[PDB]
DNA sequence: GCATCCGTGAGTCGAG
DNA sequence: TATAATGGGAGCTGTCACGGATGC
């Protein structure tokens, strides 16, 4: 009990391991059924504990180690009075082991918290509350983005519309992929050199109503 | 200046050390200066005795314990974020019953965080105070039924979690029903368990009304002590198989085993006392030669039925008696903790016996740290009574120290209490103050320990009386709990006396807390003081006799919330309690014994004492507090003064001079101004402003942590993409900036790069990119930032890192960057100033100097109060500070009025006319006669009836300075205010709320996860609640838009708020908002609970709000 | 009035000067009372030096004296030096009217 | 399930409960695969039954279910809809809303009935949309963006 | 349309099956390394959705030209990542068991 | 602590 | 009422 | 018809 | 994979104010 596990959850285990027991178990040898019955429950039950408790999902040779990790850190610090420093345990480990690796292990170790717990006295506070969403854009970088797209559809009419649409082919804002000098100029029908030197001309104009009117400037970050 | 003292009543005892309460109850927890052998059995020792022996064969035993010395001094734990504590060993011994193999060794058992000496202690590098807990004693009480008014309930009472509460109860059947577990069984049976017969309880309870026949059953006599209890265990064990060694191991468990059922050392005592035996152990019964033997049970039912019949001698409780109620202090809380984490460790000890080699096994083999440390360490970081210190100023911590509270783990719940707890009782006399407590929910729940209060070694409140013999009162002191208070009676402090003889016929005295006038040679006790009825925050209020309780509770609780000022000053009229409270909270720095100052430094005191020795005494200075105050100190000494054992040396925080100092004594005016006062708005002056009175020091810390990422790691650096010079101005060479540097909201306090997340260019940036010819750097800038509205000076740079010294920080952190922002805050319009009598207000208006009412001789006011703040709240002790402080502004001397005791009207008078002398007579030397405005003024005070007609000027002034009034001359015209206007100086302090603090506005900002709504907090930036209150305003308002504005527009509708944007931005009006993200989570949520949510047309045809997104 | 203060070894405000008894605080809050009279109409800004050291108690008169410049309250005490104790600073006054907060 | 500002996971209650869930349920598919007896069966199938019961509605019946070193109930469905800080009262009959913001207050004598007196950050930070059309309606900004990143730093402001 | 009425009713296990893009087989959530959704998982991208946006869980197809197209390697559906807010998977149980709700 | 804002 | 109790009774059976 | 048991309610913003 | 080992622990206590369901 207290391992991460259910005591139902356990007992269920070790009946899985049980019934292992008893399709593997030789009468023949004399022994009670005991004695080969507990060690397939205990297996069975420590896998389970090593499968299941922890809510990111560890293989179970890596759970071994970070057990191990926690073994000897807690001998050494009943040992030192004290707790003991990556570099400590790292030496405690034996070889193989420094700083960075018992950092790494411990940190690969570490649990998620619940977004439900409370920052408060009252019913009032969840940690979650406090935990702002950077996957959605913000109004302003939409309406910063939309501004973009006018002030390059602005500057893209100013070209005309095969220059234009070479470019917006080039750069993918026509079906957002970029096509290849090769589809460009079998598109518009003329050689690769061409089609790069009118998306050369194109992007030069750009270039030059950029340095007069600097409407794009501010977009840059 | 000379400080004049009223009063006559004189202080037999002074008051006890006020942190007492604290350290001593953590000093008899611990024992750590007592040697091993001689520590009594208590606290953790006794929680080591509880737990040890262990046994199941090996046995694992105790011998002593020891605490060493904590690893890192308490300043060092502060900023280090560590916990003061010392390291806790412990001499144990194996011994195998079978082999005889014995084997002794010490284990380390973890740590035990230690008190410091002001009482608090260090958690975390956090300063946390330990809050006494007031419950119910344990022990037995008899309470009268509220079914059946004839008939009793009687109950039995342990420590809690100690086990279970125990009802006795006569059923209207006739037979006698126990409670336990709630499961009502007849008390007969577990009689016959104890080993009663009929006999027995024939003899000791025949002499009743025949009660005793309820307890007479012919089928319980039937069966044998073993029967019974095999019965007993199958009425409370259903399911659980009635083997005999299982039922007596639950029975005792229940009933007999000092490792589970406890009564306290108070219980003891007091089921002794109320039930007229004498208990052995502290259980209701115990487990001698195989049997059951009843300690309890018996005289319990005796003492039930001896109530029940009216038996004389015999009478209920009142649980709310503090005769009844005790006080758990810290001592018992955290060894309580100690008790269960012991269990725990002796729970892993046995299961270690039972399996592994068992052979080689060592008291460290067995031995596992973790639960006890687990434990303790919950208790000091996560219990509700262990709290984050109040350090607002001195006297905030203090009271916290003192602090009672009826809360946290097996107390009360509110929402589940009552009027009867949160009254006061009448035995709080004394102990408990009837004024301090908060205004709201906790009200009556939360309290503070009185003055001259003490907690026993049982843990009740006791209060000192002097001792009268025959109308002498001797100097004899005695404390008493409230039940031997309950059995004397006690004359007032204030009653006259002629040397040690009382000099009234009829002298007024308690008789159980009830008012008596009696005779001296009735009288058996006396009160030592009037300040023992009252807290430490209570007892700073002067004139309090003037006061309604209520606004006195509001002056008493904002003392505590009073800011630390440069300036601040000691109050004109003082209670004379002001310096001991200083001397108590350890703020001020003073001399250990008699000689001579050597050095005098902002940093450091240099003393030679007596001794010839050396000791230097640094100084804190500009430290930040847990609410943000500054709390340094000053030294008040100079080079080569000589000093007496006890002078002050340095000056703590809100002290001046060895005086509690919470703000400015300013001259007041109490008159209407404009509007500008009306609803309890104050007016100030510019004047203080320009002297500085009501400045404060405020520092905020900020804290940036550069860590290792899968996508490259986080770097503290002054290099920071697409910024220029000017950004980077203040930046040092490593990235953070520097000392002394200004920074206002927008500057950058430390530089930090992270690594782009894997980004796929929108086809408008890759274009751009081409246009401009500029690579998209891989790191972007993360940089700690100022706040909006916070700024200052930068007085302080912490730089921790890995692979550094000494340094080691949580798994994955490279570094962590600590920037201190001190700014010094003057008043401004929207902070809040208050007196000690509960006049509380916001500045509403700063006016220049010309502007301010003022004084025939050209002297302005400070402050113009508001005269209708008085009548309703009835308080008129700042009335009396005010006359007083009048006189004191013109004799230019202090008081000390004490509560209860102090300068009344006469003696205000006579100083008033010194005062009045010292204000015109100069002024009539100078050569100046009456003003003609003065004249108009003397009219009109002449027909109110103040002045008596046809005395000259000068008479008629000192008449209307003599009831504290004075000429005034409005600033704007030059024309007298057409009465005599109340004039003085007054005691204000400036309150913790300020204006700085609590602006917020935000247009747009972060959003929450799963509701997609603005977060909430001014430190979020996030947006105000509307609420379903606000909602059905706008609803009665009927305004339909603006209510869907703020259910769509303004928050939550994610295309809606966007378009709305950028439709403002682009000069366009707001469009139509769309389905709210909250709804359609809602709807997800109940189809994760399979039911089906659709929203249809009035076709009765499915409308999709998820725009196919959800369906396949 | 005196409208800036610059002291040697002080970054600002809420620090200590070693061998200074007063804070910087109280030091700026002594330098905020002194009387600078200017004998000279068209001189808008005077920068007055203090410079001193040992056990001393240093008043408004160990300024260095400027030409047209006189202090009318010498007497006024700025800080409490020490043995060692070492001050040194240099205040800027300037002409103004009204009050003018920093 | 977020990673927040330290670099560590934060994770709703509901995936610990749906996790006990399918792992009783496929424990249970794999007992059955196998034969197990009756009596073993039975009980995983009443755990699967309490496992549904405490992820639908916690606490409803018998003990509520806790993660490990907690007192603290788990946050089921039924307790995400239902109560003063359920899904209804909480996040849909009121909501946090945006352009606004709070102070103390102060009484001006002097305005008209109709009047209150508006600090002028707060109203800054509340009209900003408005402000920064307004500053490229006039000549103080080129375009939305240049004003806005003008208006962030305060000594940027004229 | 315009929504002028809202229904609540019970769910068929065939309606709850219809609404799931898939069947959660494992209890795992994302992996300790790589810090992304399991297969057959609580989180997984197969079933709820595409965590960018118009890019696949291989990244095969990275552009809004591939809309409602399954990759063949990584069975991730490439559109609009707020999907993963809009779509329900489901459980299958060995057991039929009972609605709490309904029985107590 | 609530009621009119002692504390 | 308790799951534990009651399968420690059914296990208590055979 | 009348005692008794089990589940569900118990103020708002603010900071935390 | 084999000495034999065969039924678990912690409860947790000063609210009413009840509503409708269930019980002699
Ligand atoms: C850890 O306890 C937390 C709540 C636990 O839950 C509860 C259920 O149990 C308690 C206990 C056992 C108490 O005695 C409380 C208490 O006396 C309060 C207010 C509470 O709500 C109390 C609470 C609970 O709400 N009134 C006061 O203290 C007043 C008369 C003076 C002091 C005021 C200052 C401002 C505080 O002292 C402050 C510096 C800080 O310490 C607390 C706010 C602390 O917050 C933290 C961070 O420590 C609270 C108490
Ligand atoms: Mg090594
Ligand atoms: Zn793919």
Redesign the interface.
């Known amino acids: 009990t207290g391992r991460g596990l259910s005591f139902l959850d356990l007992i269920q285990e070790g009946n899985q391991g049980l019934i292992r027991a008893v399709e593997k178990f030789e009468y023949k040898r004399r022994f009670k059924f005991s004695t080969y019955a507990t060690w397939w429950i205990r297996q069975a039950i420590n896998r389970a504990i090593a499968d299941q408790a922890r809510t990111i999902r560890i293989p179970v040779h890596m759970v071994e180690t970070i057990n191990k990790l926690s073994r000897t850190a807690r001998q050494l610090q009943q040992e030192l009075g004290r707790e003991p420093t990556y570099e400590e345990i790292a030496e405690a480990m034996g070889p193989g082991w420094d700083a960075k690796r018992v950092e790494e292990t411990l940190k690969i170790a570490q649990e998620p918290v619940s977004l439900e717990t409370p920052i408060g006295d009252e019913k009032d506070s969840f940690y979650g509350d406090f935990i702002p969403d950077e996957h959605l854009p913000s109004p302003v970088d939409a309406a910063t983005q939309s501004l973009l797209s006018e002030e390059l559809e602005k500057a893209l009419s100013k070209l005309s519309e095969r220059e234009a649409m070479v470019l917006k082919l080039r750069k993918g804002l026509i079906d957002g992929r970029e096509h290849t000098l090769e589809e460009v100029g079998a598109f518009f029908g003329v050689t690769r050199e061409r089609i790069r030197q009118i998306e050369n001309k194109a992007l030069r104009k750009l270039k030059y109503h950029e340095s007069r009117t600097r409407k794009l400037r501010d977009f840059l970050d | 200046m000379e400080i004049k003292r009223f009063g006559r009543i004189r202080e037999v005892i002074p008051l006890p050390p006020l942190t007492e309460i604290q350290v001593e109850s953590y000093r008899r927890a611990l024992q750590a200066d007592v040697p091993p052998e001689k520590r009594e059995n208590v606290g953790i020792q006794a929680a080591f005795r509880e737990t040890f022996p262990i046994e199941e064969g090996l046995v694992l035993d105790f011998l002593e314990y020891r605490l060493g010395e904590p690893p890192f001094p308490q300043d060092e734990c502060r900023e280090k974020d560590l916990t003061y504590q010392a390291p806790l060993y412990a001499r144990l011994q194996l011994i195998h019953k079978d082999t005889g193999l014995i084997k002794e060794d010490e284990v380390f058992l973890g740590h035990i965080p230690l008190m410091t000496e002001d009482g608090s202690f260090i958690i975390n590098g956090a300063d946390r105070v330990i809050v006494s807990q007031i419950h119910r004693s344990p022990g037995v009480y008899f309470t009268p039924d509220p079914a059946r008014p004839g008939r009793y309930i009687a109950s039995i009472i342990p420590l809690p979690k100690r086990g279970p509460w125990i009802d006795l109860e006569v059923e209207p059947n006739g037979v006698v029903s126990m409670k336990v577990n709630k499961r009502k069984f007849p008390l007969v049976l577990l009689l016959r368990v104890l080993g009663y017969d009929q006999e027995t309880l024939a003899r000791e309870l025949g002499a009743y009304g025949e009660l005793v026949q309820g307890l007479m059953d012919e089928s319980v006599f039937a069966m044998r002590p073993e029967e019974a209890l095999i019965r007993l265990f199958t009425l409370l064990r259903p399911g659980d198989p009635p083997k005999r060694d299982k039922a007596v191991a639950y029975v005792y468990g229940l009933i007999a085993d000092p490792r589970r059922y406890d009564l306290g050392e108070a219980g003891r005592y007091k089921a002794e006392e109320k039930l007229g035996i004498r208990l052995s152990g502290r259980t209701l019964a115990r487990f001698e030669d195989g049997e059951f033997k009843d300690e309890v049970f018996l005289p319990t039912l005796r003492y039930l039925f001896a109530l029940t019949a009216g038996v004389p001698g015999h009478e209920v409780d009142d649980i709310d008696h503090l005769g009844n109620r005790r006080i758990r202090t810290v001592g018992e809380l955290m060894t309580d903790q100690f008790r269960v984490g012991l269990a725990r460790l002796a729970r892993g000890v046995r299961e270690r016996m039972l399996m592994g080699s068992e052979d080689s096994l060592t008291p460290a083999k067995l031995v596992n740290s973790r639960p006890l440390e687990a434990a303790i360490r919950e208790f000091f970081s996560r219990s509700q009574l262990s709290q984050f210190k109040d350090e607002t100023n001195p006297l905030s911590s203090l009271r916290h120290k003192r602090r009672i509270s009826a809360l946290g783990p097996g107390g009360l719940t509110r929402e589940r209490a009552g009027f009867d707890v949160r009254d006061v009782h009448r035995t709080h006399y004394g102990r408990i103050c009837p004024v301090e407590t908060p205004e709201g929910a906790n009200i009556g729940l939360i309290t503070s320990l009185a003055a001259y209060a003490r907690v026993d070694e049982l843990g009740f409140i006791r209060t000192p009386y002097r001792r009268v013999v025959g109308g002498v009162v001797t100097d004899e002191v005695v404390y008493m709990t409230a039940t031997e208070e309950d059995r004397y009676t006690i004359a007032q402090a204030n009653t006259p006396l002629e040397g040690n003889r009382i000099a009234a016929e009829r002298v007024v005295a308690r008789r159980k807390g009830e008012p008596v006038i009696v005779s001296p040679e009735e009288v058996e006790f006396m009160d030592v003081s009037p300040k023992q009825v009252f807290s430490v925050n209570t007892n700073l209020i002067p004139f309090l006799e003037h006061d309604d309780a209520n606004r006195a509770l509001m002056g008493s609780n904002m003392q505590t919330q009073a800011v630390p000022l440069?300036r601040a000053q000691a109050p004109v009229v003082m209670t004379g309690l002001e310096e001991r409270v200083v001397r108590d909270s350890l703020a001020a720095l003073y001399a250990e014994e008699d000689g001579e100052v050597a050095?005098?430094?902002?940093?450091r005191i240099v003393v030679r004492y007596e001794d010839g020795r050396l000791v230097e005494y640094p100084l804190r200075?500009?430290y930040r507090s847990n609410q943000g105050t500054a709390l340094?100190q000053?030294?008040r000494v100079?080079?080569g003064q000589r000093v007496r054992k006890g002078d002050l040396l340095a000056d703590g925080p809100a002290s001046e001079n060895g005086f509690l100092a919470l703000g400015q004594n300013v001259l007041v005016a109490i008159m209407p101004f404009d509007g500008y006062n009306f609803e309890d708005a104050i007016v100030i002056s510019?004047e203080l402003?320009?002297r500085?009175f009501y400045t404060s020091?405020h520092i905020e810390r900020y804290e940036i942590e550069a860590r290792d990422t899968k996508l490259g790691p986080e770097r503290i650096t002054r290099d920071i993409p697409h910024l220029s010079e000017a950004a980077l101005r203040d930046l040092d060479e490593e990235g953070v900036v520097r000392?002394?540097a200004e920074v206002k909201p927008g500057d950058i306090l430390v530089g930090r790069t992270s690594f782009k997340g894997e980004s796929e260019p929108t086809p408008e940036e890759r274009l751009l990119r081409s246009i401009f010819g500029e690579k998209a750097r891989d790191v972007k800038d993360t940089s700690l930032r100022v706040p909006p509205g916070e700024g200052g000076?930068?007085?302080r740079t912490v730089r921790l890192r890995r692979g550094d010294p000494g340094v080691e920080l949580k798994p994955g952190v490279r570094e962590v960057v600590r920037v201190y922002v001190?700014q010094?805050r003057?008043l401004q319009v929207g902070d809040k100033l208050a007196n000690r009598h509960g006049n509380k207000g916001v500045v509403a208006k700063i006016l220049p100097v010309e502007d301010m009412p003022h004084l025939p001789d050209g002297t302005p006011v400070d402050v113009i109060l508001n005269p209708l703040g008085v009548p309703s709240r009835m308080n008129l002790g700042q009335i009396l500070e005010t006359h007083l402080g009048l006189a004191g502004y013109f004799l230019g001397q202090r008081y000390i009025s004490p509560i209860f005791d102090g300068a009344k009207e006469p003696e205000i008078k006579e100083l008033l006319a010194q005062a009045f002398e010292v204000y015109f007579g100069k002024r009539k030397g100078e050569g100046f006669g009456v003003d003609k405005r003065e004249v108009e003024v003397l009219r009109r005070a002449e027909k109110l009836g103040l002045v008596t007609p046809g005395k000259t000027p000068e008479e008629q002034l000192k008449e209307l300075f003599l009831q504290g009034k004075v000429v005034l001359y409005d600033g704007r015209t030059g024309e007298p205010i057409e009465g005599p206007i109340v004039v003085g100086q007054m005691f204000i302090m400036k309150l913790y709320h300020m204006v700085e603090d609590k602006m917020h506005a935000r247009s747009t900002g972060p959003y929450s996860l799963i509701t997609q709504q603005p977060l909430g907090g001014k430190a979020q930036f996030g947006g105000q609640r509307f609420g379903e209150m606000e909602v059905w305003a706008l609803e009665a308002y009927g305004a339909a838009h603006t209510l869907q504005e703020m259910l769509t527009l303004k928050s939550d509708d994610i295309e809606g708020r966007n378009a709305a944007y950028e439709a403002i931005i682009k000069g366009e009006d707001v469009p139509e908002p769309s389905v709210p993200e909250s709804f359609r989570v809602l709807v997800k949520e109940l189809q994760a609970l399979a039911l089906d949510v659709q929203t249809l047309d009035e076709k009765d045809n499915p409308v999709d709000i998820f725009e196919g997104l959800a369906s396949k | 009035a005196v409208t800036s203060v610059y002291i040697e070894d002080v970054?600002?405000?809420?620090?200590?000067?070693?061998?200074?008894?007063?804070?910087v605080?109280?030091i700026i809050?002594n330098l905020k009372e002194l009387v600078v009279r200017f004998l000279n109409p068209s001189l808008q800004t005077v920068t007055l030096l203090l410079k001193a050291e040992g056990?001393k108690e240093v008043k408004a008169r160990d300024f260095l004296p400027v030409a047209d410049v006189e202090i009318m309250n010498p007497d006024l005490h700025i800080a409490?030096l020490?043995?060692g104790?070492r001050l040194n600073m240099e205040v800027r006054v300037d002409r103004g009217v009204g009050?003018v907060?920093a | 399930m977020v990673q927040v500002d330290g670099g560590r996971f934060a994770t709703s209650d509901l995936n610990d409960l749906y996790r006990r869930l399918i792992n009783r349920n496929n424990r249970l598919k794999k007992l059955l695969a196998q034969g197990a007896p009756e009596i073993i069966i039975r009980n995983e199938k009443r755990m699967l039954q309490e496992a549904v019961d405490a992820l639908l509605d916690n606490g409803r019946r018998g003990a509520p279910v806790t993660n490990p070193g907690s007192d603290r109930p788990l946050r089921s469905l039924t307790d995400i809809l239902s109560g003063k800080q359920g899904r209804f009262r909480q996040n849909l009959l009121g909501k946090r809303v945006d352009y606004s913001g709070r102070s103390v207050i102060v009484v001006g004598p002097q305005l008209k009935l109709h009047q209150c007196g508006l600090p002028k950050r707060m109203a800054l930070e509340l009209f900003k949309p408005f402000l920064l059309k307004k500053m490229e309606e006039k000549g103080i900004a080129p375009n939305v963006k240049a004003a806005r990143r003008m208006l962030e730093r305060q000594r940027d402001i004229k | 349309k315009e929504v002028r009425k809202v229904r609540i009713a019970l769910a068929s296990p065939e309606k709850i099956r219809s609404w799931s893009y898939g069947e959660v087989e494992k209890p795992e959530t994302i992996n300790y390394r790589t810090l992304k959704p399991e297969r057959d998982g609580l989180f997984d991208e197969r079933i709820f959705g595409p965590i960018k946006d118009y890019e696949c869980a291989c990244g095969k197809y990275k552009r809004q030209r591939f809309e409602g197209k399954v990759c063949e390697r990584c069975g991730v559906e490439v559109t609009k990542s707020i999907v993963r807010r809009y779509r329900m998977g489901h459980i299958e149980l060995a057991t039929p068991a009972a609605h709490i709700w309904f029985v107590k | 602590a609530x009621x009119x804002x002692x504390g | 009422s308790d799951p534990v109790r009651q399968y420690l009774h059914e296990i208590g059976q055979v």
């Open positions: 440069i050095k005098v430094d902002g940093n200075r500009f340094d000053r030294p100079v080079v510019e402003l320009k500085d020091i000392i002394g000076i930068v007085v001190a010094k003057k | 970054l600002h405000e809420f620090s200590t000067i070693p061998g200074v008894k007063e804070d605080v109280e809050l056990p409490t020490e043995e104790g009050y907060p």
